[PDB]
Design a protein around this motif. Structure first.
Motif, short mmCIF file in Angstrom:
data_model
loop_
_atom_site.label_atom_id
_atom_site.label_comp_id
_atom_site.label_asym_id
_atom_site.label_seq_id
_atom_site.Cartn_x
_atom_site.Cartn_y
_atom_site.Cartn_z
N UNK A 116 0.94 -1.27 0.14
CA UNK A 116 0.14 -0.08 -0.07
C UNK A 116 0.83 1.19 -0.22
N UNK A 117 0.25 2.24 0.21
CA UNK A 117 1.03 3.61 -0.03
C UNK A 117 1.73 4.03 1.29
N UNK A 118 1.63 3.40 2.24
CA UNK A 118 2.27 3.54 3.45
C UNK A 118 3.58 2.41 3.48
N UNK A 119 3.49 1.52 2.56
CA UNK A 119 4.61 0.54 2.62
C UNK A 119 4.18 -0.47 3.42
N UNK A 120 3.20 -0.86 3.57
CA UNK A 120 2.51 -2.17 4.21
C UNK A 120 2.14 -3.21 3.06
N UNK A 121 2.64 -4.26 3.09
CA UNK A 121 2.46 -5.48 2.07
C UNK A 121 0.99 -5.65 2.16
N UNK B 217 -10.44 -2.54 8.05
CA UNK B 217 -9.37 -2.17 7.25
C UNK B 217 -8.97 -0.70 7.63
N UNK B 218 -7.45 -0.97 7.86
CA UNK B 218 -6.74 0.13 8.50
C UNK B 218 -5.86 1.07 7.53
N UNK B 219 -5.41 2.20 8.13
CA UNK B 219 -4.16 2.80 7.73
C UNK B 219 -3.50 2.90 8.98
N UNK C 241 -4.16 -1.49 3.80
CA UNK C 241 -5.27 -0.68 3.17
C UNK C 241 -5.02 0.76 3.22
N UNK C 242 -3.71 1.14 3.56
CA UNK C 242 -3.43 2.67 3.54
C UNK C 242 -3.13 3.12 1.97
N UNK C 243 -4.21 3.77 1.59
CA UNK C 243 -3.92 4.13 0.25
C UNK C 243 -4.28 5.69 -0.13
N UNK D 29 -2.21 13.68 -2.37
CA UNK D 29 -3.32 13.40 -1.43
C UNK D 29 -3.09 12.66 -0.20
N UNK D 30 -3.83 12.73 0.73
CA UNK D 30 -3.34 12.15 2.12
C UNK D 30 -4.02 10.58 1.79
N UNK D 31 -3.45 9.68 2.47
CA UNK D 31 -3.68 8.23 2.42
C UNK D 31 -4.81 8.22 3.46
#
Ligand code: NA
Ligand code: NA
Ligand code: ZN
Lengths: 443, 480
Positions: free
Chosen positions: B311-316, B332-334, B348-350, B356-358
């Motif tokens: 995801x856009x925070x680097x979490x697979x 689902x989290x960020x 799920x951080x997208x 734009x903010x995730x």
């Protein structure tokens, strides 16, 4: 003021550079650039939540050669990036097919000397000043009633922009604009049912906005009104589109009379030019040059002049909404509608909202719609609705989890009246609209 | 991927690892729980066929950096449409102003870890020749027109995206992704005796354009989809008024999984639940759906439009079971919302872009298959609707009301599918609708690669899926 004049100079130069680079290798070209800068903040329970600094820039070009077109865009406006963007569009135009309706807008229609519409009213609002406005709005909502048990926050936005357009007929014009807005959104609860609603204010100058306390009061009023809705039983009944959704009801007209839809025969109004499609007392006026107007523009997205027109005059459809391409497909001239419509005004017929309820007597007021559900090609209409049930000319209870269905042709033709309660924060501005009958699906 | 992306996004723009340290350090001057730097470059192309000719093409480029500073509920955010040291410094210095107080400066050492590859790093824009791409569109046009004499217009478009991303954070995360995405869309207009209607098909995924020329059940995929758009258009052309009111609705497999996306998906995003604004807030462990229902959000599906290798925070990306045999398992989290809820990131951080903010967002959302045959499901309905295809939908997550609108639907009369009916919006309460699911088919599929999800003005690619299923009572927005 100096930041924006520095940007405007850079942007004009970028347009001129792109056009010069295109000119030796294309028969025509159009270039659009913009820059929007500002701040967006939010609060949660009166405390800062988010602070976002916005700065967006853009250049797009379309080139034409042998009636073949190609387009490219970039957010980098360096000379080398502009050169690559121009080359990319030229390369595409080697491989697209000749299309004689494609090309730069007609020279005779261009806004070479575009009017100043007074769209630019900057304010130096600091993040801390912005947070305080958002907090005031949110707090005013939260303190209104003890059933307000949660929040989606206060929000404040303030931005300024610069747009420049040029083309290969020698047009090069640009203008500045501002927009500011303040909102809040809260949640109320009763007997385990939660509802959420919002309120807002918007304008080109900060001094045109409602107070934060007004926004909060309106937010709380709207939210509390939603509590404990009923699901109506399936029925036929009259329907009032409250002002805030009535604007969208007329909004469906835009797609239905767009030249792109017309030449492709993909609109249910294809055979309606010069026919009475609305009541004979109803006129829709377009006013592109209103000073400070929310959707005023000195030229369209192809640089074409915008004009005062009555799109509907005494119920009659007077014209299509054309761009250069669709006009050429139809053997007509552009009407300055590339990028959409520019302030529609529909006058009230004398009744307040309260008087409209009394006239209707028994029926549904819709205040919110959900889903798409509108067929461009048939006019068939089916949307989820929330609002209120009315009986004895008085609101009885909120309703939700229902749909309303019909067909736009019949809906528009048989409008009973339009109210004097005009929604003034939108592109299309009108009051509430009474229809004699729709199919309500529910229990 | 990391070394290759680092060379393109960092080295090529005069940046090193140590510049990442310096900028994260600038954020960490303030009292923050977290800060990150997000780098992106992307390339988009499109080609459009209409009126039997290649009408249009476009090539769009963007690049930039986004910088966030987070303390509890609070985020400061600034970004620039360029990748440079100065852009990073200016963005960090603006973002960190979210909190005035000094921090201890104790960041975690940057350190990348492996993740499973879910899609190729081969650029789809460059992997196929221009004439071969245009031949896909020409073939769609030819096949659609040849399918039925009533076909009068065909619009066929090809879109391709190639995106590089790199994220670096104060919690030590250092991660990169290379993301291809292609889509073929087809729209046809049919006419008979002055009556006109439209139909559409298409799809795609995270791979090159060769997918559209590969086999689909013994024919070329592009051809099959061309024929599907015509078939859809002709059904619509014959359709009669839909019935109005509450009745049984049988939903087809695949894209009718929009049901799940609207009825539970958004409602299970952790931002709404952390705030307490979702109907699902505080309901973990409760029955929120029928016992036949297991709903997952799965970011791990190889090659799929909705998947996220990171995801856009680097979490697979993860396989996340949200509802299991009707029981709510979690959200689902960020990273932000997970910390505030005492939970862990779920992949799920997208965010739509660097600008734009995730936030918590879906990936591929689907229901697991059950024991019933589709035929058994249809045969169980005396009067109702069969809806094998939908357009979009929408949901109010607070009041728990959702809608979705049919694009192909039929009456069911005496256990048999009968007359095609016109488009109708269906409406219900999310939880109540899921509790009304009485039969779940053995025929799970996902959509063809068409999903777009919108939240807070940010549009993302997603997937949906389900088997055929029966909802015992749903309100149908017909006229009849
Ligand atoms: Na020239
Ligand atoms: Na894995
Ligand atoms: Zn969505």
């Amino acid at each position: 003021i100096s930041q924006v004049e520095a940007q405007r100079k850079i942007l004009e130069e970028a347009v001129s550079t792109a056009l010069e680079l295109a000119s030796g290798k294309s028969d025509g070209a159009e270039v659009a650039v913009s820059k929007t800068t500002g701040i967006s903040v939010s609060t949660r329970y009166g405390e800062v939540e988010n602070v976002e600094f916005n700065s967006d820039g853009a250049l797009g070009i379309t080139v034409y050669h042998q009636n073949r077109k190609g387009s490219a865009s970039s957010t980098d406006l360096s000379p080398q990036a502009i050169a690559r963007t121009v080359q990319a569009a030229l390369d595409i135009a080697r491989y697209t097919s000749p299309d004689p309706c494609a090309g730069v807008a007609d020279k005779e229609l261009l806004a070479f000397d575009a009017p100043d519409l007074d769209l630019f009213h900057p304010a130096e609002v600091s993040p801390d000043e912005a947070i305080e406005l958002a907090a005031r709005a949110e707090q005013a909502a939260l303190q209104a009633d003890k059933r307000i048990t949660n929040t989606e926050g206060g929000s404040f936005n303030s931005h300024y922009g610069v747009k420049v357009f040029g083309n290969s007929h020698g047009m090069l014009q640009g203008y500045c604009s501002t927009r500011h807005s303040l909102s809040s959104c809260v949640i109320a609860e009763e007997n385990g049912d939660m509802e959420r609603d919002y309120a807002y204010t918007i304008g080109r100058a900060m001094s045109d906005l409602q107070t934060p306390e007004w926004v909060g009061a309106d937010c709380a009023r709207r939210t509390l009104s939603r509590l404990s809705p009923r699901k109506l039983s399936t029925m036929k009944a009259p329907v009032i589109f409250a002002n805030e959704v009535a604007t969208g009801l007329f909004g469906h007209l835009v797609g239905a009379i767009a030249g792109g839809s017309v030449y492709r025969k993909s609109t249910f109004l294809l055979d309606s030019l010069g026919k009475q499609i609305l009541p004979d007392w109803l006129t829709i006026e377009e006013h592109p040059h209103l000073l400070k107007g929310l959707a005023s523009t000195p030229f369209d997205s192809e640089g074409v002049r915008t004009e005062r027109r009555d799109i509907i005059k005494d119920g009659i459809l007077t014209q299509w909404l054309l761009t250069s391409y669709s006009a050429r497909k139809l053997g007509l001239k552009s009407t300055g509608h590339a990028g959409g419509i520019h302030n529609w005004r529909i006058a009230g017929q004398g009744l307040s909202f309260e008087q409209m309820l009394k006239e209707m007597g028994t029926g549904l007021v819709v205040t919110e719609l959900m889903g798409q559900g509108v067929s461009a090609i048939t006019g068939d209409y089916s949307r989820g609705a929330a609002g209120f049930w009315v009986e004895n000319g008085e609101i009885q209870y909120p309703v939700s989890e229902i749909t309303i269905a019909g067909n736009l042709k019949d809906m528009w033709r048989n409008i009973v009246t339009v109210g004097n309660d005009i929604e003034t924060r939108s592109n299309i501005q009108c009051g509430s609209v009474l229809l004699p009958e729709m199919k309500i699906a529910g229990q | 991927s990391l070394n290759l992306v680092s060379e393109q996004l960092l080295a090529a723009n005069g940046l090193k690892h140590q510049d990442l340290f310096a900028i994260l350090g600038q954020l960490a001057e303030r009292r923050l729980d977290y800060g990150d730097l997000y780098f992106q470059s992307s390339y988009h192309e499109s080609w459009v066929l209409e009126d039997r000719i290649i009408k249009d093409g476009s090539y769009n480029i963007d690049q930039g950096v986004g910088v966030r500073a987070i303390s509890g509920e609070k985020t400061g955010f600034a970004y620039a449409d360029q990748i440079s040291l100065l852009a990073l410094e200016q963005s960090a210095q603006a973002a960190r102003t979210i909190v005035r107080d000094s921090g201890d400066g104790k960041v975690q050492t940057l350190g990348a870890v492996e993740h499973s590859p879910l899609y190729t790093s081969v650029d789809p824009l460059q992997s196929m020749s221009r004439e071969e791409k245009l031949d896909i569109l020409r073939r769609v046009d030819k096949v659609a027109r040849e399918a039925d004499k009533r076909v009068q217009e065909v619009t066929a478009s090809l879109s391709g995206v190639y995106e590089l991303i790199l994220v670096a954070a104060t919690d030590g995360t250092l991660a990169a992704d290379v993301r291809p995405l292609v889509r073929l869309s087809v729209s046809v207009l049919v006419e008979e005796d002055g009556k006109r209607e439209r139909g559409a098909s298409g799809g795609g995924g995270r791979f090159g354009y060769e997918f559209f020329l590969a086999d689909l059940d013994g024919e070329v995929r592009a051809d099959a989809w061309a024929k599907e758009a015509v078939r859809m258009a002709l059904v619509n052309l014959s359709a009669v008024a839909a019935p109005a009111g509450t009745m049984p609705v049988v939903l087809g497999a695949g894209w009718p999984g929009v049901l799940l996306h609207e009825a539970v998906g958004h409602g299970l995003e952790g931002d709404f639940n952390r705030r307490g604004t979702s109907v699902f807030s505080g309901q973990v462990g409760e029955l929120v759906a029928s016992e036949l229902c297991t709903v997952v959000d799965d970011g791990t599906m190889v090659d799929r439009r909705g998947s996220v290798a990171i995801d856009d925070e680097g979490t697979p990306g993860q396989y996340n079971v949200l509802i299991e045999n009707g029981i709510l398992k979690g959200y689902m989290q960020d990273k932000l919302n997970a910390r505030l809820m005492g939970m862990t990131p779920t992949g799920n951080g997208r965010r739509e872009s660097y600008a734009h903010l995730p936030m918590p967002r879906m990936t591929n959302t689907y229901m697991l298959p059950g024991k019933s045959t589709p035929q058994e499901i249809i045969e169980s309905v005396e009067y109702g609707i069969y809806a094998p295809n939908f357009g979009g939908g929408q949901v109010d997550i607070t009041s728990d009301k959702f809608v979705f609108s049919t694009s192909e639907a039929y009456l069911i009369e005496n256990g048999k599918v009968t007359k095609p009916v016109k488009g109708a919006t269906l409406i219900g309460s999310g939880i109540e609708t899921m509790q009304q699911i009485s039969m779940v088919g053995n025929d799970l599929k996902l959509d063809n690669g068409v999903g777009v999800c919108g939240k807070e003005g940010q549009s993302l690619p997603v997937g949906v899926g389900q088997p055929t299923l029966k909802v015992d009572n749903l309100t149908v927005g017909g006229t009849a």
